[PDB]
Design a protein around this nucleic acid. Structure first.
Ligand SMILES: [Mg+2]
Ligand SMILES: [Mg+2]
Ligand SMILES: [Mg+2]
Ligand SMILES: [Mg+2]
Ligand SMILES: [Mg+2]
Ligand SMILES: [Mg+2]
Ligand SMILES: [Mg+2]
Ligand SMILES: [Mg+2]
Ligand SMILES: [Mg+2]
Ligand SMILES: [Mg+2]
Ligand SMILES: [Mg+2]
Ligand SMILES: [Mg+2]
Ligand SMILES: [Mg+2]
Ligand SMILES: [Mg+2]
Ligand SMILES: [Mg+2]
Ligand SMILES: [Mg+2]
Ligand SMILES: [Mg+2]
Ligand SMILES: [Mg+2]
Ligand SMILES: [Mg+2]
Ligand SMILES: [Mg+2]
Ligand SMILES: [Mg+2]
Ligand SMILES: [Mg+2]
Ligand SMILES: [Mg+2]
Ligand SMILES: [Mg+2]
Ligand SMILES: [Mg+2]
Ligand SMILES: [Mg+2]
Ligand SMILES: [Mg+2]
Ligand SMILES: [Mg+2]
Ligand SMILES: [Mg+2]
Ligand SMILES: [Mg+2]
Ligand SMILES: [Mg+2]
Ligand SMILES: [Mg+2]
Ligand SMILES: [Mg+2]
Ligand SMILES: [Mg+2]
Ligand SMILES: [Mg+2]
Ligand SMILES: [Mg+2]
Ligand SMILES: [Mg+2]
Ligand SMILES: [Mg+2]
Ligand SMILES: [Mg+2]
Ligand SMILES: [Mg+2]
Ligand SMILES: [Mg+2]
Lengths: 101, 116, 70, 87
RNA sequence: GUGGGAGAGGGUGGUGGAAUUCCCGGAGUAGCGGUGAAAUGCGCAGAUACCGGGAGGAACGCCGAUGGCGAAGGCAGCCACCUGGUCCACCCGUGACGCUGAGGCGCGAAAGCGUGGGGAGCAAACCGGAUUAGAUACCCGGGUAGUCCACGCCCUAAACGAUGCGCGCUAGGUCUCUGGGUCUCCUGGGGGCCGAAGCUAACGCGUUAAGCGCGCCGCCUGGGGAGUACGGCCGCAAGGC
C-alpha cells in the first residue's frame, strides 16, 4: 500500500439521491480494490477553466488513500466507467515542497 | 431584414487576402466581404487598402441590417490585419472590444515544406 | 516590474488543487510564465510546471485564453 | 521494487557475523536478488533494452565476486553457490 | 551497507487540450486559393469566412535554457505501474576482489524489406500549372509508397567533440545544473566561457587537455584506380563486413 490522492469530477446538476448515489458506488469501488481511506475533502461546485462535457462548471471531490499498487490502475478504470464521472485523477501523495519558504 | 442591433466582426487576415465577416451575438453571420469581393484580383487582394475597402464594405452591408455595437475578433497576419481594424473603427461602427484569437496548435500537424 | 514570488505568501509549490495561487503564474493567455517573470529557481520553476499541468487537466486552470486590446 | 524489510532479511540470512554488511557472500546474495527481479521484469517487457544492459552489468559483478571467492576460500564458494542455486 | 537526492534513461497500460482534415447542422454570397506575377485547383449540387455537434490519426505550445538523462543510437503533454543508470553524506562492512579487452554476444537515427493493421497532415515516384533558350529543377496545385502501431529482418551515417577507455599529476577567473556544509563563501559530482605552465604546423587545447605520465585495445603508411574486382561470410532483397 502507498499514499494516493484521488480526485473525482462529476456533473454539477445531480440532485441528492443521485449525488449521494455516485458517492456510494465510488466508496464501493475503493473498498472493492482494497483502498483504505485516510481522509476526504469535498469542494463540490467550482467554475471550471474551460468546459468539460459541455459544462461551464464541475463537482469536485478528493480522496486520500493507501492501497496496493497492482490495483490502483484498474481501480481508476472502474472509477471512470460511470457516465456521470467526467474526470478521474489519481496521484501518489508527495510531501509539500515550499517556496517563498 | 433581420434587424440586428449589436454583434461581432471577424477579421480573417492572410498573406494572400483579407476577409471580414459580421455576425450576431451567438455567431451566425450577417454579411461579409473580402478583397476580391471588391474588384481586386491577384496579389492586389492582399494590400492593406484591400483590407480597408473590405472592412468598410462589410460594415455598410451590416448597417443595412441595422448593426451598431461591434465586438471584434482577429485571426491571422498580413498587411491590413491592422488596416482592417483601423477602417473598421472609422466606419461609424462604434467598436466595443478588439480581441486577437489567432489560433495556434499545441503541435500536431506536419506543415507544408513552405513552412519549416 | 514585480516578480511573482516577490509578492506571495509561504506557499505550496506542490499542490495542484489551489487555483487562487497558481493562476498568478500565467499571462492573460493561459501560458506559464518564464523565470524572467516568476522569479523562481531552476527546480522551483520546474516543479511549478508540473503542478500547473495537473491543475489544467483537472480543469481548474486554462490551457489558453485570448488577447484583449490589440 | 525491493523494500528495506526484504533486503535486510536477505542480509541477515547471508551474513558471516552479526552486522557484516559487506562480505562477498552478502554481495553475491543481494546481487542475485536484484538479478532475478530483473529477469522477471524482462520476461515480460523484452522491448526494454536499457534495463537489460543494467542486468548484464550486474550479472558480471556477481561473476567477479564469485571468481574471487572461488580463488580464495573454495569452501565458502562451494557452500554459497549451493544455498544460492547457481551453475 | 545506511540515509538523502535530481532527471524528456527504458518498458507497459490509461488519459488531456490546442490544431489540421473529414462528416452533420444552422446562418450567410461569390468567391476562395495560391504567386514574383500567374495559372492549374476548388466554388451555384452554395464554397471560402462564422457558429454548434461528431469521427479519426498524428504530434505535444507556454514551461524551455547558453538546461537535464543516457554507453551510444537517442530521449519532451499529464497519470499509474514495472525497471536501468547515477550523485552526495555517514566512515559502518568486505579486504586488491583491479584496468583494458582480439573473438563472441547485445544495442544501434533515418531510409529500406516481410507479414498484419492503420492512415489526419506531410509526402520520393507520379499527374498537372507555371517559369525558362529547354525544366525531367527550384515556385503552385494534386498525389502513391512511406511516414504511425505489432512482430521479424536490415547494421549503415558528417553514428562528430571528425577527439578510444581507466588512473595519477599540473595557477586561476567566470556562468551554470544537482547534493552536502558552521550557506560573504566553502566541499563533492555534471555542464559552458576565458585563461597559468605546457603543447601545437598553424588554428587551437589548456583539472571536461589536444599538457605531464602509465596500462590496454583500434587504426595509419602519397593521389587516382576503389570501398571497385575477386574470394569468403552474412542478408528475403536492397545490400553489409
Ligand atoms: Mg466519462
Ligand atoms: Mg491572392
Ligand atoms: Mg509540392
Ligand atoms: Mg540507498
Ligand atoms: Mg523519461
Ligand atoms: Mg518513463
Ligand atoms: Mg500516449
Ligand atoms: Mg455545411
Ligand atoms: Mg473564376
Ligand atoms: Mg462549378
Ligand atoms: Mg469551374
Ligand atoms: Mg468544428
Ligand atoms: Mg477514418
Ligand atoms: Mg522554446
Ligand atoms: Mg552525461
Ligand atoms: Mg545529436
Ligand atoms: Mg531509479
Ligand atoms: Mg573503513
Ligand atoms: Mg579486518
Ligand atoms: Mg537500425
Ligand atoms: Mg525506419
Ligand atoms: Mg513495411
Ligand atoms: Mg499536400
Ligand atoms: Mg512536372
Ligand atoms: Mg511546360
Ligand atoms: Mg560495424
Ligand atoms: Mg592515445
Ligand atoms: Mg570551470
Ligand atoms: Mg546548498
Ligand atoms: Mg565545475
Ligand atoms: Mg579556451
Ligand atoms: Mg602560453
Ligand atoms: Mg583529469
Ligand atoms: Mg586525462
Ligand atoms: Mg594533437
Ligand atoms: Mg597507390
Ligand atoms: Mg558502399
Ligand atoms: Mg582474391
Ligand atoms: Mg562477393
Ligand atoms: Mg546467399
Ligand atoms: Mg549502397
Amino acid at each position: 500500500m502507498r499514499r494516493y490522492e484521488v480526485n473525482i469530477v462529476l456533473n454539477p446538476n445531480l440532485d441528492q439521491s443521485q449525488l449521494a448515489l455516485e458517492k456510494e458506488i465510488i466508496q464501493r469501488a475503493l473498498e472493492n480494490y482494497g483502498a483504505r481511506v485516510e481522509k476526504v475533502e469535498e469542494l463540490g461546485l467550482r467554475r471550471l477553466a474551460y468546459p468539460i462535457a459541455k459544462d461551464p462548471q464541475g463537482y469536485f471531490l478528493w480522496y486520500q488513500v493507501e492501497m496496493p499498487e497492482d490495483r490502483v490502475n484498474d481501480l481508476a478504470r472502474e472509477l471512470r466507467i460511470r457516465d456521470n464521472v467526467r474526470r478521474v485523477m489519481v496521484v501518489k501523495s508527495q510531501e509539500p515542497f515550499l517556496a517563498n519558504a | 431584414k433581420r434587424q440586428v442591433a449589436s454583434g461581432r466582426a471577424y477579421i480573417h487576415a492572410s498573406y494572400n487576402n483579407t476577409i471580414v465577416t459580421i455576425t450576431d451575438p451567438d455567431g451566425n453571420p450577417i454579411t461579409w466581404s473580402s478583397g476580391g469581393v471588391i474588384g481586386y484580383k491577384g496579389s492586389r487582394k492582399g494590400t492593406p487598402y484591400a483590407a480597408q475597402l473590405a472592412a468598410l464594405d462589410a460594415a455598410k452591408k451590416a448597417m443595412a441590417y441595422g448593426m451598431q455595437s461591434v465586438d471584434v475578433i482577429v485571426r491571422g497576419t498580413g498587411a491590413g490585419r491592422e488596416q482592417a481594424i483601423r477602417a473598421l473603427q472609422a466606419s461609424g461602427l462604434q467598436v466595443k472590444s478588439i480581441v486577437d484569437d489567432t489560433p495556434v496548435p499545441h503541435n500536431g500537424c506536419r506543415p507544408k515544406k513552405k513552412f519549416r | 516590474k514585480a516578480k511573482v514570488k516577490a509578492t506571495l505568501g509561504e506557499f505550496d509549490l506542490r499542490d495542484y488543487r489551489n487555483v487562487e495561487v497558481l493562476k498568478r503564474f500565467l499571462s492573460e493567455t493561459g501560458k506559464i510564465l518564464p523565470r524572467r517573470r516568476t522569479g523562481l529557481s531552476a527546480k522551483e520553476q520546474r516543479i511549478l510546471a508540473k503542478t500547473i499541468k495537473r491543475a489544467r487537466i483537472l480543469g481548474l486552470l486554462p490551457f489558453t485564453e485570448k488577447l484583449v486590446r490589440k | 521494487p525491493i523494500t528495506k524489510e526484504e533486503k535486510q532479511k536477505v542480509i541477515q540470512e547471508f551474513a558471516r557475523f552479526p552486522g557484516d554488511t559487506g562480505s562477498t557472500e552478502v554481495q553475491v546474495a543481494l546481487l542475485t536478488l536484484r538479478i532475478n527481479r530483473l529477469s522477471e521484469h524482462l520476461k515480460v517487457h523484452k522491448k526494454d533494452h536499457h534495463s537489460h544492459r543494467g542486468l548484464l552489468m550486474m550479472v558480471g559483478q556477481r561473476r567477479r565476486l564469485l571468481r574471487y571467492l572461488q580463488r580464495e576460500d573454495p569452501e565458502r564458494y562451494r557452500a554459497l553457490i549451493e544455498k544460492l542455486g547457481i551453475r
